[PDB]
Amino acid sequence: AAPGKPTIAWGNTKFAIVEVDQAATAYNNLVKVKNAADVSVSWNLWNGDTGTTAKVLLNGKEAWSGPSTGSSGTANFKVNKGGRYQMQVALCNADGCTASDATEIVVADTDGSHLAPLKEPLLEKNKPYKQNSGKVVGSYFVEWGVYGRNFTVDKIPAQNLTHLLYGFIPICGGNGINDSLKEIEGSFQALQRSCQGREDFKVSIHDPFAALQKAQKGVTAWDDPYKGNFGQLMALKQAHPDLKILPSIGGWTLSDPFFFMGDKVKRDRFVGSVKEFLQTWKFFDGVDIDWLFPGGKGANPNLGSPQDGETYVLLMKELRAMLDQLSVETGRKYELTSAISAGKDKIDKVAYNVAQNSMDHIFLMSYDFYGAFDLKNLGHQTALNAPAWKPDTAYTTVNGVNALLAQGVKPGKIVVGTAMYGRGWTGVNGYQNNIPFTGTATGPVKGTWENGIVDYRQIASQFMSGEWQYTYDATAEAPYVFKPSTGDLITFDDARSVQAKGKYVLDKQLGGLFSWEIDADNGDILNSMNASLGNSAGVQ
Ligand SMILES: CC(=O)N[C@@H]1[C@@H](O)[C@H](O[C@@H]2O[C@H](CO)[C@@H](O[C@@H]3O[C@H](CO)[C@@H](O[C@@H]4O[C@H](CO)[C@@H](O[C@@H]5O[C@H](CO)[C@@H](O[C@@H]6O[C@H](CO)[C@@H](O)[C@H](O)[C@H]6NC(C)=O)[C@H](O)[C@H]5NC(C)=O)[C@H](O)[C@H]4NC(C)=O)[C@H](O)[C@H]3NC(C)=O)[C@H](O)[C@H]2NC(C)=O)[C@@H](CO)O[C@H]1O
Secondary structure, eight states: OOOOOOEEOSOOOEEESEEEOTTOOSHHHHEEEOSSEEEEEEEEOOSSOOOSEEEEEETTEEEEEEEOOSSEEEEEEEEOSOEEEEEEEEEEETTEEEEOOOEEEEEEOTTOTTSOOOOOOOOTTOOOBOOOSOSEEEEEEEGGGGSTTOOOGGGSOGGGOSEEEEEEEOBOOOTTTSGGGGGSTTHHHHHHHHTTTSOTTSBOOSOHIIIIISOBTTBOSTTOSSOHHHHHHHHHHHHOTTOEEEEEEEOSSSOGGGGGTTSHHHHHHHHHHHHHHHHHSTTOOEEEEEOSOTTSOSSOTTOOOTTHHHHHHHHHHHHHHHHHHHHHHHOOOOEEEEEEEOOHHHHTTSOHHHHGGGOSEEEEEOOOSSOTTOSSSOOOSSOSSOOTTOTTOSOOHHHHHHHHHHHTOOGGGEEEEEESEEEEEESOBOOSTTOGGGSBOSEEOOOSSSTTEEEHHHHHHHSSSTTOEEEEETTTTEEEEEETTTTEEEEOOOHHHHHHHHHHHHHHTOOEEEEEOGGGOOSHHHHHHHHHTTOOBSOO
16 A cells, blocks of 8 residues: 655745845845755654655655655755745655645745735826837836835836836945945945945945845745845736836946946956846846946036047947847846936937947936026926027927937937926026026925925925916926915926827837836826827726
């Protein structure tokens, strides 16, 4: 007769192919990639013949076998593929095999293969849209938004996007390399902590806690291997296989390191670390380069040179070569994109007509044209065209696009930007013909989280009544609110201005639309981005 039926003994059932130290602060101690997870299982047989051979089955497939020597045993084996498995211990002899009831074991991997899909209902004013326009619909999610702004990955209306960008991935470096970070409390210090023992100019993760250790919906167990933003993004991929999730390197406060990459030694080290990063965090689909900006004029007044244009083109070609090599290794397809200035004076410092050959998309930052950074020359911060009171306005969306086209950039590579926040001034005065933009201000408007900036969500619920005047400039395609008594002026993007941008994109055959930043919208902006680009309503 066949052996008796054994039972599985108490013991941990959660393992991982890629290990993460949930208490680490340094990137070099934070993660360790292995070829497989080391799984262990023990069993007991209280009644019956114990057989002659013991086997471990995973979803019915043999993963281990050995001599059965008694009423109890232990098996140690490797599992090289992530997932949730139905594991059983079977005892066999010449007369047959007898399998125990199944115990679920989890083998985690960074592609999110061990996680149930993170499929959350749409919140606030977000409405469902099908991505059938064939146009890009992207938005940036910020790593630090899980704190003060209290916006997590589960709150992203993911079904309404084709591209989700993660801002921002930093480049290691101390004094003289990341000085721009010193303007934000503890930001410079956090990066040094993360880069402890790591070579300068290699990429890293700015806030390991927010990225991998903070408990969040779907990855809330005290012993889950991947938590925080990355853990949720992994689960999000399971729910949306076609969504492109990209890591964005740089941004306003993390661009200083790019200025040193004219040195091939540093550039090679950088490109190399990006490859290893992508091999480590499998849920990412490529890389987005946000160098602000080649030639200078960024956050650091002491950086920028005429050599930057060449370095940029060299960098993109080198990254594309690295991604091709990675593709032959994994068989996957990777995207290479970049967010750039929309000002003509900056665009011409780079030969995008050449760089475009190794890029999938160009995220034209058609916003921040005006703002509290200049209290004398006011104007629409993200308008499509120039206003009637100054047809020669230099900074507009159309001017940015024309500059690229004039170089030879293919229209299909250009993705137009929308703003999910407004910029404002206070004490505006000395204006003519009831056009506030013609005067001057005395400071920044009180912001939602920081001076001179207001979330669209707050504009819609707080500044659309009372003494606030509302006006939609149909010439420039830009709305704005103004409070005469205090001189508060706010320029932003609304459902209508975004609609104009989308129609413009379809008319000129551009790539689509993207926005900054997802947490600031209440649903109106993204709904319009989708609708204006031709996507049809209804869940898919
Ligand atoms: C046409 C022309 O040439 N015009 C010029 C114009 O372009 C220039 O303005 C600059 O434009 C560029 C684009 O060209 C802007 O950069 C891009 O656009 C977005 C939106 O502006 C940028 O977003 C900012 O990103 C920074 C980081 O890079 C954000 O900084 C964060 O600040 C928050 C505080 O609110 C920090 O949060 C704290 O975090 C800690 C944890 O670290 C947490 O514990 C706290 O709770 C939390 N506190 C709060 C309050 O929540 C956070 O740490 C920090 N993050 C980092 C990494 O530093 C900043 O908030 C973003 N601002 C807005 C608005 O959202 C983005 O960098 C970039 N996008 C991309 C994809 O590259 C640039 O911002 C803009 N500069 C300025 C000064 O506005 C102007 C000026 O030079 O000149 C014209 O001529």
